[PDB]
Amino acid sequence: RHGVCWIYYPDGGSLVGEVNEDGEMTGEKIAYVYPDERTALYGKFIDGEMIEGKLATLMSTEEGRPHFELMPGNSVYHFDKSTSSCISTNALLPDPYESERVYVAESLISSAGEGLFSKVAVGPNTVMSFANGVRITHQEVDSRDWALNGNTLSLDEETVIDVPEPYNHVSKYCASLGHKANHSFTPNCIYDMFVHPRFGPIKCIRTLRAVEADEELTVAYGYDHSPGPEAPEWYQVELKAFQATQ
């Protein structure tokens, strides 16, 4: 009863702390621990919602209890789920886990603009980046031109996450960087569901295989190929070519 509870999400992140009398993750010393089991946001939570989490490192666990060291600076984070019109209350405050793992630079893919790259070598199944954005409906997205739908990502059957211009510029939005991954029919990453303590229910980019430092991260965009394909022209072209090599 003076013990510690760990609750893992399927994505591998967890909440950890002493639960209250009702069995809720509520207290001043609750933590969210990212999937590396090392990076943590440690502080005040109410029923598992982050009110004020300070950046920390999980240094060891003893008898199941985590022991944290706070990182320098006064890096604090709070639950801040996007709405249909607001992407983030701190658009320029990077996610600390993501910022150690990826960076944005010119893509190696011809004519594809910027892309997402690994900062370090990592193994398979590694969460690399987070896909956050404004939350709009499939009806809104499907009713408008492809020119407006470059950055849209389906979250589930009710919600599409979008990063509307000009938040597609890293100088205007860099809280998450997952929208920067380019498409490949032979990708090294996939989208997966992710429950984030700041962003809420979103998607992440996870590696399929080991990746080297400075390797471009790509995902299969997964547009419907036989509703020709409902897709931008650059994708339709690439699809034909891909089918050829097959």
């Binding site: 739908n149 849209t152 990502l153 965009y221 547009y223």
Partner: peptide, 8 residues
Amino acid sequence: SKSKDRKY
């Protein structure tokens, strides 16, 4: 759908 990664 005009979005990535929809389950069809």
